[PDB]
């Protein structure tokens, strides 16, 4: 190999391979952001003209351009596909991919297989971008054109919120170690897939459409789809309600050979102005499209909502056939239905023709048994559909609160783990004083309260900004019962005083001012850092902003809550069994979920470690003498060369740390010495480990506690 | 292969390994900053106690610590070295390298072979660092502790500045394509080294210790000495003076087999701390000390400053031998000198030693007539050392307003490309605006005017911050005949008109205010813009700071200002011969260069495309109908679905674009039609060639034309 110009990609990595790489902690720096610091997306969205949108796509969809003609005259079903797939890389063991960042205008999901002539799809919209441009990101306008092309050709969706953020650098994932493009190195035992991956080859969104490994299996398809479309939190009735209004429009292209289609977009020469998959066979678009290679077209209405996909599907039997390219697909034996089935641009008219994965919807018999109820009342069909698809592009949405825009419905759904609103006056400055002592004054130790408030607001991630202090849920199940929260039942004690205090506040307070339980948790936390402070010689205040509210048991889906359950927490030294890497990758990927910098994530490790939210408080990285006290005494021990590290005799991921005399005066984690050991960290400890330094680390260390308390608050920003 | 997790490593540069990698535009972001956005070093260090901290210094340097022990109970010796290879790094073809950002903590540079044993150099300062805090960068510690050094052992310094602010991430930086360290590819001919190259060997700081690759030839060795200090801005004088300088302290360390050596340290594992090098040779430190292979003590006093080496060097003959660990070195023949040359740890005294390279002193023919004197007038070794050592640790400190603190002498240096005080009052605001009319008025285009301007400004690099339009040095040789500045023709009328408004406002001007061609030639540019956008119906104004002041060819090191010429420059669409790379790296190159984001780099384009600022006034992608007219046209044309791009015939590096009558309407560079292929400079495309995004795009691009003219303009901030 050999090392290349830092414009070219060359840097460290390539010295040391398996570096913990830190740029995952600036990720989308302000920087690389071209609009002003005061520039607010939310603000922007929230005075634009819904309709005059929606006539300005209704144009162009309508409007063939010559570089990639128009089937059937109609651009709806292409866009349908695009927000699809761009809200489809969504998956649930992490919360990322999905449309939130509209992160498919970028590499590597722009060049991926499966999103093969979405770069024209895109390209496409860019007169209604240019026409709203501030107004409208490319997140929001990629799966509005889907939303609006569904109504355009008569399905009534159930609504749809604005606000997703447009970046400007792609957010580097990992979508599975196939260093080859449509590889599988992702199953073990019986078909167990690669968490946290949800789809079955490197670069598809779900499944192969031509069945598993090319094989166009109906039934083995199927497990494949079920599976897939679980991990991105669709069920077996949502699945065959998304599979079956898709495929009720449009048309697959596979007009010619596949080996005649050029370089993906990342790959093309310059001339092709970011557009990729230039196609030599024929006219290389239109009649001459090849996108999958596959060469269906579902339903002889391509552009109108109807039931004719399910009465297709039903009312022919099929039999194994190729495509032009040479692709599986299926079509309709004995020449029935012959000539029934439109041509994108005026041609003779085909016959009926299906996927492998569209027959699993008739031959599974889980699916048989949806699809046949929707096949006798079609009804039923466009109201799951409706509910999954609102559910599928708005998934890594966050809170309500994100929603913007007149089309928000007002409903409340489950899977968006809703807390109920405020109704009653909030705390002010007195009654947050009144109760931070109160808090004090209960026999709750530092310990206890920091390492409570922490697991509650830690259960965010910022991937799809789900989890979080708001709805109280951490006296929920599943959260009440999860390893790292609750290793010895301390838990329920902390639960049970914050209960008396919220009811004994609540009777006694003054005229219909209220505290909910999801408030006091977070600011016992803060109560006990302020207690910690003191101890340690500063005299600070820990903001808080109220306005949590409780949510219920029955509001509180346990299932889709089990994702959220860290199996790996560096701030609390906690490291559960299965994570993917050593435990300081999971502590930089735990920080990147809690959208924290490299210097918020340092504070917080040293400040978290006196103040005893360890899980199980065991000693590991405890470099202080002294008890619940917020001193910088984790970076300063840290730097101290009178230490000789060693791993433990016992192997057990842990290290021992011995003076002068050889007497063991600390242990400590890898989690703990990676920040002495790695030379962006101890630079970062360096300075925090200072004679000059320790009113800078209380500062900062509130500073970052007080973000973290605050990640979901959608509903104050 | 296999593609790895992000926080490992991993991501889109393994797809595409040769892509335009824009993370070069946005090194040591401001998330990673551990101080504040309001953290003023200047102010910091101006506090400091510089007496307190020589002491602090002298009580490390004599303090020996238990985990490296110090040679003569002294470690001035091995910060020398310290402080010599954290500027050794420094290349005049780039000016990257240097002290000046304290780069040899990070990797690469912490972990270089050439850098063995100093990561417990470093460590030693550490208690020093943490006394003063953020008063003191460890980027000035670390030659300070060098330059103290000297000092502690009897050599008077001629001064010191400090001012280096420390950074937070590695700057990746071309070190050559050797994926094997120690390794050599960048040899053609007879030893014509690789540009950008400073060193003969990856990893080395600048030649091998043994004569070229291994081969003790001192007459061979002083040719690759005297290519790589000059590629370091050494001549042959300051080169002789910084080895005697240097070698007449401290000894080199190869007690014992290297295989015994450990790994460096970003290798090493967790509870080394950020140490490398971990040695099982006997007590791998001290008495049994291994860092290069070679055990060498030039002099009998080796912690004192006197003329012992060349003494040695010449009252002595010299015959070839082996160290302890198989490394090539010399000895003194016929056994002259037993037991004179003491021994760091009280052992028995030894022989006299040289490396091959010391006898390159003495055997080649320029460098013997130049030590055979400074063997008889040690009053001018002194001098020359304390000059060049002097101006090897400061000379990526940028212009001389940037020295701080109290030792700093006045004299001025012509290596400091000097400009001249401040000699009269300065234009005010009535003044400045009078002026931009004489130049409106002046026959000068905003074709000419504008690019005068960024002729000059863009002359600076961030790298050793040399460079830049402060010096009026536009007018003098050798900017005024750079191929890019003045392809033969239109220069020299702009400087004659503006010479001329020189004289009109200075011999009339009112009382004591004059005005600079330095001052003027940026004033102008200034002035088109606002012209420029008058045309386009905006009335603007484009900030402007007076101060500059105009230097002599006097006042002007020749061949100094060669490496600043640029073989290339995007933002003028020039692209000469000898680049290692396609123009779009070049550009972005030179991008970071100017310090500018990926949005600055991306306005700034646009925006000199539309007002002629192109290398031979060519048409490549001035993508607008408007003569000197400042608008977005370039992005909106850009994202012209309606015309097509390919390359032209010709095999130009060229392309045009046809509108749909087939018509060549556009054309344009490699470095144009990036902006519209590459998908993140395409984003930004798209937030610019947007409807209501003109008055922004003004904004930007005066804002960011702003910084470029400013980039040198230390002297008012
Ligand atoms: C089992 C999962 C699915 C598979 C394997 C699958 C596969 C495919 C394939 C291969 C194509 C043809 C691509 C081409 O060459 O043009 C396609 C087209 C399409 N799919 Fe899917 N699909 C799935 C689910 C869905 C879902 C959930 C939706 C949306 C609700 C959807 C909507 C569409 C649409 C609209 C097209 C038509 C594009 C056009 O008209 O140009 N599909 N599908
Ligand atoms: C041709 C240029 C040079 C070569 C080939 C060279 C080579 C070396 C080598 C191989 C060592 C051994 C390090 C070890 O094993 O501990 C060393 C040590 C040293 N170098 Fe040089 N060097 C050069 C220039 C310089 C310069 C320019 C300076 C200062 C201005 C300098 C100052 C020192 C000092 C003080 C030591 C002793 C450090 C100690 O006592 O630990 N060297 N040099
Ligand atoms: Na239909
Ligand atoms: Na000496």
Chains 1, 2 share one sequence.
Not at 26 to 54: K, R, S
Not at 198 to 209: D, R, S, T
Not at 232 to 252: P, R, S
Not at 257 to 284: H, I, R
């Amino acid at each position: 190999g050999h090392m290349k110009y830092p414009v070219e990609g060359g840097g460290n990595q390539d010295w040391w391979p398996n570096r913990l790489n830190l740029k995952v902690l600036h990720q989308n720096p302000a920087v690389a952001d071209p609009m002003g610091a005061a520039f607010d997306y939310a603000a922007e969205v929230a005075t634009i003209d819904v309709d005059a949108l929606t006539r300005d796509i209704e144009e162009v969809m309508t409007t063939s351009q010559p570089w990639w003609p128009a089937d059937y005259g109609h651009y709806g079903p292409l866009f349908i596909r695009m927000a699809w797939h761009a809200a489809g890389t969504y998956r649930i063991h992490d919360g990322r991919g999905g449309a939130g960042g509209g992160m498919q205008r970028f590499a590597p999901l722009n060049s991926w297989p499966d999103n093969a002539s979405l770069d024209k799809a895109r390209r496409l919209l860019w007169p209604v971008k240019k026409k709203y441009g501030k107004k409208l990101s490319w997140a929001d306008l990629i799966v509005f054109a889907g939303n609006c092309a569904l109504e355009s050709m008569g399905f009534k969706t159930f609504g749809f919120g604005f606000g997703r953020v447009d970046q400007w650098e792609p957010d580097e994932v990992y979508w599975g170690k196939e260093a080859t493009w449509l590889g599988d190195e992702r199953y073990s035992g019986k078909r167990d897939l690669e968490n946290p991956l949800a789809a079955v080859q490197m670069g598809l969104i779900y499944v192969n459409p031509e069945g598993p490994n090319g094989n166009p299996d109906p039934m083995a398809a199927a497990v494949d789809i079920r599976e897939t479309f679980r991990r991105m939190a669709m069920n077996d009735v949502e699945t065959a309600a998304l599979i079956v209004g898709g495929h009720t429009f449009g048309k697959t292209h596979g007009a010619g050979p596949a080996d005649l289609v050029g370089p993906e977009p990342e790959a093309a020469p310059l001339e092709q102005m970011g557009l990729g998959w230039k196609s030599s066979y024929g006219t290389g678009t239109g009649k001459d499209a090849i996108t999958s290679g596959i060469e269906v077209v579902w339903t002889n209405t391509p552009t109108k909502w109807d039931n004719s996909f399910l009465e297709i599907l039903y009312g022919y039997e099929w039999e194994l056939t190729k495509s032009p390219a040479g692709a599986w697909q299926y079509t309709a034996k004995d020449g029935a239905g012959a000539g029934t089935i439109p041509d994108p641009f005026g041609g003779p008219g085909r016959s009926p023709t299906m996927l492998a994965t569209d027959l699993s919807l008739r031959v599974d018999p889980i699916y048989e048994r949806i699809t046949r109820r929707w096949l006798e009342h079609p009804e039923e069909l466009a109201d799951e559909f409706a509910k999954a698809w609102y559910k599928l592009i708005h998934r890594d949405m966050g809170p309500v609160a994100r929603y913007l825009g007149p089309l928000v419905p007002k409903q409340t759904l489950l899977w968006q783990d809703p807390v109920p609103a405020v109704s009653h006056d909030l705390v002010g400055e007195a009654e947050i004083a009144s109760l931070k002592s109160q808090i004090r004054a209960s026999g709750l130790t530092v310990s206890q309260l920091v390492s409570t408030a922490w697991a509650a607001a830690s259960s965010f991630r910022g991937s799809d900004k789900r989890g979080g202090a708001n709805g109280g849920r951490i006296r929920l199940q599943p959260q009440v019962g999860w390893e790292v929260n609750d290793p010895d039942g301390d838990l329920r004690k902390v639960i049970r005083t914050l209960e008396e205090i919220q009811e004994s506040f609540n009777s006694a307070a003054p005229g219909n001012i209220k505290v909910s339980f999801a408030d006091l948790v977070v600011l016992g936390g803060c109560a006990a850092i302020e207690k910690a402070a003191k101890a340690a010689g500063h005299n600070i205040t820990v903001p808080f902003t109220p306005g949590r509210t409780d949510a219920s048991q029955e509001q509180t889906d346990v299932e889709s809550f089990a994702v959220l359950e860290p199996k790996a927490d560096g701030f609390r030294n906690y490291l559960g069994k299965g994570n993917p890497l050593p435990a300081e990758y999971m502590l930089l990927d735990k920080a990147n979920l809690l959208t924290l910098s490299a210097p918020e994530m340092t504070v917080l490790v040293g400040g978290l470690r006196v103040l005893g939210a360890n899980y199980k408080r065991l000693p590991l990285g405890v470099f202080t003498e002294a008890s619940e006290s917020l001193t910088n005494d984790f970076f300063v021990n840290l730097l101290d060369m009178g230490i000789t590290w060693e791993p433990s005799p016992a192997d057990d991921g842990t290290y021992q740390g011995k003076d002068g005399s050889g007497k063991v005066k600390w242990t400590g984690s890898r989690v703990d010495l990676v920040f002495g050991s790695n030379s962006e960290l101890r630079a970062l400890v360096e300075v925090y480990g200072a004679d000059d330094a320790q009113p800078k680390f209380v500062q900062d260390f509130v500073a970052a506690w007080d973000k973290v308390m605050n990640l979901d608050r959608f509903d104050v920003r």
